[PDB]
Symmetry: D2
């Protein structure tokens, strides 16, 4: 019995060779992950056809040997920023993946700001599931945080120095229902650089305007307070922050404020995890015990090439609920330049301690089948990229983010 | 939840508009049938993608208003000759469909004999399922019964008078396993017209040569005897005969000899059903009781336009087993020019008498969902085309053949 | 020797059947026009491939029998708003065509404002000719006059009453050089309806801001004066006005202000042609003599169905030069609901009087070859749509606009 | 002004990525050659679209790094066997190219004999030019010399030892008229290996049968006599012989018998060039003086890697005219494993001696623009493959055959 991705690659007609190459790289990874976590074959077919129809045509050029064709500059290797599996209690596992929608002529004089690809992906996905994409939050936040083509082209001298001219990132939560929840991330770096306004101010002003004109509670007081301090700016790269929302009914959606911090201790990490004691409770302590566990387990081990850990790179989101005044943190450990073996051992020890044996086996199956380089090459550095840790009232919430184009780098 | 054909038509990229139009006509029919008989969604996706990849590109031009584009002449309306559901005991139901593979330029000076389309379909299907298409029987019977392009073009003056220059028909048994069994039919009319040899002789000589060079028992004595008589030729249109084989291991395949007969009584029908008393047993009597039942039930009712039944059009196959000397008949009643309502009532009465209530509901569901014209238009004549009746040792074996392009004629 | 459109339709691979159908309708028309006016075969191939690559994929659904698939409402029949041939002295003839870029899912919940198609066309055309599309004027005028998707979706209640939610129209001057000059038209009806500001004010404020931030002279004083009067509004449908610019270096581009007027006399027509005596000179008088000639020649003749001419429908542009303070008028007579025979006779008499015999034969050749319905059907009403008249210092400037999808309406 | 291949690659939609890659390799070469020899842009577009539509889809997989995807074995690198420019007197230059039509699944269990691709190419080309492909000669010679799929699959044990299971090669003479003359080559190695008959016998029996059933004179007496001798077989690899015909009206076509010979002297070369003194006259002597000139000029120079010339590899055709009893030779020197610089110097010296300065500059332009590796790499071995020499009554006839996929090997 062939697998959905094999059979589909056999039958599917592709509009461009780059789509076929992206397919050959990614469809096995995504399918193996969905299968290992237990998605039904109906659902695998539907999600792989979403990937074929809506995502891959908006993924951009497929890298050649010298990457002479990647005209859209990025610190991230071409392709999805990540494919992720989130593990919770009750053997709950969801597949997700993030893409910075890149057009095929982005970075060229015709699309110097990559303005259409996210919109094309939105449109195609909405056609594939009418009623699955609500553009209310997108329509409010796009003018404020995002920069259109015209504005970016008039104000080019202001932003040409920026290496990654990203303005919209799109993630798909590929649900076990064959439903794909779209999530939009806006890095407002271009907005700030053109308006010479601060990230904090534009983001939270957009949030407050949405509050006003929607009647929904998105409490950002604590986040703004913490993020405007100077002790935070000492470690924070606030220019690396972004705003995320689920593209749904604003009453069922969220707002999330992301920022990057290069820290050295778990005190500086608790600083971001609790916004300076402003957030407290049992969930905070449980989540930070998980954080310290994975910190000691991953960042204690040595790096490749005997390189020293100058500091530890973390990202952080604070999630604001449209129903309540409840800021909840999610801490991302960056592990892209660590040993995939040590990362996997840390994940396995964590799951084992939490009683998640099924998740251990799912993670190992995904590693073995979809990321063979982890065992073939003992000095593997390309598969795993991020570990997200959170503690909801449901329990722990651990997302493992991997590079599904590691094949390309090995 | 969308259906596989809806979602696929949304996502699938088609190489030609005619493929898209054929899809819009046929995918709902085929999917509704597969669903009603209980095929899993995995299997529906796989079979609809076979239809999209291998079949529809070899179905030919999609008819316009005036059919100015159907350059390949045929008595059958463009598209599949039939989509069929076979019903047996134990609530067993299989979906099948028959296509005369027509190229897009067949009947034009470039492909005046339609030589490649069957081969293209064979190749594509074999790629989609390596090991599912055995070409042994095809390779033996193609030179004998079929005519290649070169031979047909040198000997054109001999066959240009033929209206339907068909040489290969291909049917797919779309199994509940998502496996597609390919069956090949060869009408040797062109072979006979060029060699001015008799159909009987070329067909049974090919059968005997396969016997010799394979060591398999295909007893054609009784069939040859019956079909060479003159009383048979009085009713038989032997020039309408053809040879069918399943494209599998010859030891697991069959050979089937088909012929057309326009008869007037059930005595002349028993003549073909038993080869003149040569075939006998309980299966023969049971099957012919079913035949008489459906005869009285369908051909007694009046025709549209008050037209009189000059005679009754039947086809007949005799199936020879590669294991035994066991000729088994299958009798086809032609109902294309009858009332679909009376045909459906006959089918329902038959199933009810046999104790097949699930099959009654499956047939009615397929009629309602995939052939709405049967209820919308009380004078419906386009959906149902054939009723095949047989009695295997397993029990009755009744196949309902419908025109899945009835949409086009209504 | 086949023609470029025949051979290309034979070889070209189309992404969608609608593109193939649009091709079958339009490529003969466009090719016949380009050929009749004398474009080299190299140029015909290049322009037809532009049409195949950039235009037709952004033309929208191809109308079926009942037009059940045209979800984007418009008073204009689906397809190009016009294909035009402009005739000047010296046997100068240029081919042009106008398209309202419509996406394939425009008017549906996924693209309710048709936001991407014009941008996709711009991008594709810029890729096909890097340096041929300057977005400076587009980037300045798009935020002001045009409405993005987000704004249109937040402010939907304000504009849902509008039947034609058009915001960007794109014309291509297909030059004899195989260069395609892109021209962008913005109808600011949505901008005005959302901001409840007047068309005059938003348009001329955008023009003045471009003046300021570009240092180019675009004198709109006379146009604003005339268009804000009340006597003008008595006849003018100012809500039908739009702003056009050539997508080039603003110093080599133009600005043009278009408005519709349903008038009854040539006094009311001179009112628009001279902005109320504000524009004067020999060019004005010559051009208006041509206007009166064609008025008497076309609108004197009777209509089909014996319907009476309630009034005469004209459009008008005033062209402002980036170099000088020189407003120049161009008057459009609407002839869509006249007899194509009388329109053609008027055109021929005009050309003959002007000494344009080559143009007479070019026009008759285009009528005969690309619009046969004009002779086949004596009561032809679908081919010709507009006659534009102007008198530049070079001489007369007469553009004949035709519906290149008349095939679809006959 | 872009070139036809650049613009077309920009606009053309490709059915498969391999077609796009083959295009990127070959369209510049073919276009540069056609342009350098003076084909009009109309003609370049038409021929490149033939290449895009009919040829490249039947060229087969595009080789990856390790050629893991070339499942169809061949001594020749994947792609065209050659692109050629023929030079004659009067500054006459014609572009040609040869392809062994390979399907995309040839060499796999579904197409183990590559049976359809030549037929698909024939059909597509005939559609692109109805009346340009006459299948009379093809229809007569295909059953005799070529092996169909069924025969090759029944008789597999007889031919599986053959490395190159080629049966049909197709060349296109891309005329300055934008007309493409198709030429078919049949290597009957499979026919002989299955029938265990000699190449000579099957080929000349097919020729004699065509004579009989056509009334055309194809004198093969001298060729048969020479090729059946034993002294010839001492040097001749008769199993490497093939039969060529132009796919036209047999009265305007030719028959050509090709064979390979690895010789050591020009006496052994004259043996093939004159069939052992059987062919004589001034043309023979002139052509062989040209042959000796190029022999001394090319095979005297040393090889790369200091490897010794064991012997010199030549091919030879004898052309029989459907009008006369006139066998004419054409001698092919193999130069694939020589220095491209010495080959080019020999060609240039030859042309110069013949007074062909325009041809010298055309050849140098093609080398510089389409084969830059010849100057970039002084040790170039991949561009030039063959030099054909003949002396018709018109004068010399020198064809330079190059590998248009040298890019892939450098
Ligand atoms: C790409 C963009 C500039 C911005 N920056 C980031 O670092 C993260 C990337 C990421 C994916 N999964 C975990 N982290 N997301 C973003 O949207
Ligand atoms: C089409 C061909 C000439 C030949 N003739 C026929 O009548 C039947 C058609 C058929 C399909 N299902 C039931 N009957 N089959 C054949 O192969
Ligand atoms: C379509 C749009 C609303 C707007 N309105 C019009 O009437 C004209 C149409 C037109 C095409 N060629 C001559 N006249 N142009 C426009 O841009
Ligand atoms: C490929 C086939 C087996 C056979 N063998 C050959 O050697 C030549 C190849 C060739 C191309 N141009 C000059 N020589 N042609 C053929 O048809
Ligand atoms: C996805 C990129 C753009 C940032 C990392 S965050 P993630 O959101 O994918 O995880 P969650 O939705 O918060 O569950
Ligand atoms: C299918 C056409 C060509 C003839 C009617 S016969 P059928 O074979 O489809 O039915 P069976 O295989 O005999 O079961
Ligand atoms: C083209 C539509 C949108 C309006 C009619 S005006 P036209 O501009 O095509 O003619 P000109 O450029 O003014 O020459
Ligand atoms: C072309 C391959 C198959 C063999 C070399 S011969 P060529 O025929 O291309 O040259 P001519 O037609 O003889 O002019």
């Amino acid at each position: 019995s062939p697998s959905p991705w094999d059979f589909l690659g056999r039958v599917l007609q592709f509009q461009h060779g780059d789509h076929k190459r992206w397919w050959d790289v990614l469809a096995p990874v995504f399918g193996i992950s969905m299968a290992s976590i237990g998605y039904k074959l109906d659902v695998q077919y539907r999600h792989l056809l979403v990937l074929y129809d809506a995502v891959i045509p908006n993924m951009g050029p497929f890298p050649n040997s010298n990457a002479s064709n990647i005209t859209w500059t990025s610190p991230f290797p071409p392709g999805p920023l990540e494919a992720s599996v989130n593990y919770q209690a009750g053997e709950s596992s969801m597949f997700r993946f993030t893409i910075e929608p890149v057009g095929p002529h982005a970075g060229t004089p015709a699309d110097p700001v990559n303005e259409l690809a996210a919109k094309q992906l939105m449109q195609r996905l909405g056609q594939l599931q009418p009623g699955g994409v609500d553009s209310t939050m997108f329509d409010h936040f796009y003018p404020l945080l995002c920069v259109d083509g015209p504005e970016a082209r008039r104000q080019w001298d202001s932003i040409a120095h920026i290496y990654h001219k990203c303005h919209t990132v799109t993630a798909l939560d590929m649900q076990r229902s064959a439903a794909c929840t779209l999530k939009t991330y806006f890095p407002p770096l271009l907005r700030s650089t053109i308006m010479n306004t601060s990230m904090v101010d534009i983001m939270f002003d957009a949030v407050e305007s949405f509050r006003k004109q929607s009647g929904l509670y998105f409490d950002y007081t604590k986040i703004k307070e913490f993020m405007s301090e100077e002790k935070t700016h000492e470690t924070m790269m606030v220019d690396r922050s972004y705003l995320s929302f689920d593209c749904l009914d604003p009453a069922k959606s969220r707002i999330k404020i992301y920022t990057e911090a290069k820290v050295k201790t778990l005190e500086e990490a608790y600083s971001f995890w609790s916004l300076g004691g402003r957030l407290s409770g049992p969930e905070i302590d449980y989540g930070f015990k998980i954080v310290s566990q994975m910190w000691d387990a991953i960042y204690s081990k040595e790096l490749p090439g005997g390189k020293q850990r100058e500091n530890n790179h973390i990202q952080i989101n604070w999630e604001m609920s449209a129903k309540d005044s409840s800021v909840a943190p999610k801490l991302y450990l960056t592990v892209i330049e660590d040993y995939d073996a040590y990362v996997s051992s840390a994940i396995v020890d964590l799951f084992t301690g939490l009683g998640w044996a099924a998740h251990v086996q799912t993670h190992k199956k995904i590693e073995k089948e979809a990321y063979p380089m982890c065992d073939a090459n003992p000095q593997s550095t390309h598969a795993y990229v991020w570990i997200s840790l959170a503690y909801k009232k449901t329990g722990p919430y651990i997302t493992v983010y991997t590079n599904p184009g590691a094949s390309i780098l090995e």
